[PDB]
Design an enzyme around this catalytic site. Structure first.
Site, PDB file in Angstrom:
ATOM      1  N   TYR A  45       0.776  -1.228   0.000  1.00  0.00           N
ATOM      2  CA  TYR A  45       0.000   0.000   0.000  1.00  0.00           C
ATOM      3  C   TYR A  45       0.810   1.282   0.000  1.00  0.00           C
ATOM      4  CZ  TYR A  45       1.065   1.052   4.794  1.00  0.00           C
ATOM      5  OH  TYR A  45       1.731   1.353   5.945  1.00  0.00           O
ATOM      6  N   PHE A  55       2.528   9.894   3.417  1.00  0.00           N
ATOM      7  CA  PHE A  55       2.798   9.770   4.849  1.00  0.00           C
ATOM      8  C   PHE A  55       3.279   8.369   5.228  1.00  0.00           C
ATOM      9  CE2 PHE A  55      -1.798   9.093   4.281  1.00  0.00           C
ATOM     10  CZ  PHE A  55      -1.982   7.864   4.908  1.00  0.00           C
ATOM     11  N   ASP A  56       2.840   7.353   4.479  1.00  0.00           N
ATOM     12  CA  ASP A  56       3.249   5.970   4.755  1.00  0.00           C
ATOM     13  C   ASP A  56       3.085   4.979   3.592  1.00  0.00           C
ATOM     14  OD1 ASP A  56       4.439   4.172   6.698  1.00  0.00           O
ATOM     15  OD2 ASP A  56       2.449   3.242   6.859  1.00  0.00           O
ATOM     16  N   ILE A  75      -7.535   1.203  10.463  1.00  0.00           N
ATOM     17  CA  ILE A  75      -8.614   2.188  10.311  1.00  0.00           C
ATOM     18  C   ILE A  75      -9.851   1.558   9.632  1.00  0.00           C
ATOM     19  CG2 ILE A  75      -7.241   4.299  10.447  1.00  0.00           C
ATOM     20  CD1 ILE A  75      -7.399   4.177   7.198  1.00  0.00           C
ATOM     21  N   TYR A 101      -8.857   8.711  10.727  1.00  0.00           N
ATOM     22  CA  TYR A 101      -8.317   9.159  12.008  1.00  0.00           C
ATOM     23  C   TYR A 101      -9.059  10.345  12.635  1.00  0.00           C
ATOM     24  CZ  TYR A 101      -4.288   6.101  11.182  1.00  0.00           C
ATOM     25  OH  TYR A 101      -3.468   5.010  10.992  1.00  0.00           O
ATOM     26  N   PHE A 118      -5.490   6.108  -0.273  1.00  0.00           N
ATOM     27  CA  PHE A 118      -4.702   4.847  -0.256  1.00  0.00           C
ATOM     28  C   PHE A 118      -4.736   4.105  -1.577  1.00  0.00           C
ATOM     29  CE2 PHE A 118      -5.907   5.453   4.184  1.00  0.00           C
ATOM     30  CZ  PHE A 118      -4.683   5.287   4.856  1.00  0.00           C
TER      31      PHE A 118
END
Length: 127
Positions: A45, A55-56, A75, A101, A118
């Site tokens: 991902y 961010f990730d 999440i 979040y 995502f």
């Protein structure tokens, strides 16, 4: 591409139809084959803020993110998103903070009230 397309054209995959999780298939998954709640899922991902900044990513470590589907270990948009995925499928999820979040965020990566984008690939799942 285009978070604006997921917004305009995506499928609302929330039971509530509040558009909090929106999806577009980018690669069609194999079998009509999907995990159930409790199955072990292995995803690759990329997570972008709605300013495009990442961010990730599972590609930073080169390590699949693994978890138990449906158990709140991720999440809400992922338990939801991934439950709609077939093995081998890549999709794009635009996710409202409500299913991500919220107005708490997850600093320092994710500010408060953030809409998250995502790209999730479902590599595999086990019982």
């Amino acid at each position: 591409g285009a978070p604006a397309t997921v917004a305009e054209q995506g499928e609302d995959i929330t039971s509530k139809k509040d558009r909090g999780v929106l999806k577009i298939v980018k690669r069609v998954g194999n079998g009509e084959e999907t995990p159930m709640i409790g199955d072990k899922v292995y995803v690759h991902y990329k997570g972008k803020l709605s300013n495009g900044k990442k961010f990730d990513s599972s590609h930073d470590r080169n390590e699949p993110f693994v978890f138990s589907l449906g158990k709140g270990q991720v999440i809400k948009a992922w338990d939801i998103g991934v439950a709609t995925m077939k093995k081998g499928e890549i999709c794009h999820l635009l996710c409202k903070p409500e299913y991500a979040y919220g107005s708490a965020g997850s600093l320092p990566k994710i500010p408060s009230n953030a809409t998250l984008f995502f790209e999730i690939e479902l590599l595999d799942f086990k019982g």
